[PDB]
């Protein structure tokens, strides 16, 4: 409510660790938790996979 949770990747990113997600620019994400500020927990609408993503790499859509 009020807060937007659908995001789009602005750049390509390759997971560095076992916890983070890799993605293509243009890939959409449902955000599961954004309370930490640097790393957000999310789900890829493309693979159905779950994991962390850098918040500075994605932008709000719709």
């Amino acid at each position: 409510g009020t807060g937007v949770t659908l995001f789009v990747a602005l750049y390509d990113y390759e997971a560095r660790t076992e916890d983070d997600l890799s993605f293509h620019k243009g890939e959409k994400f449902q955000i599961l938790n954004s309370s930490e500020g640097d790393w957000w927990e999310a789900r890829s609408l493309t693979t159905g996979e779950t994991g962390y993503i850098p918040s500075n790499y994605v932008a709000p859509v719709d």
Binding site: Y11, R16, T17, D19, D20, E36, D38, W39, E41, Y52, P54, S55, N56, Y57
Partner: peptide
């Protein structure tokens, strides 16, 4: 949350 810093934006 990985912490090892998100790399700066391009």
């Amino acid at each position: 949350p990985p912490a090892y810093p998100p790399p700066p934006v391009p």
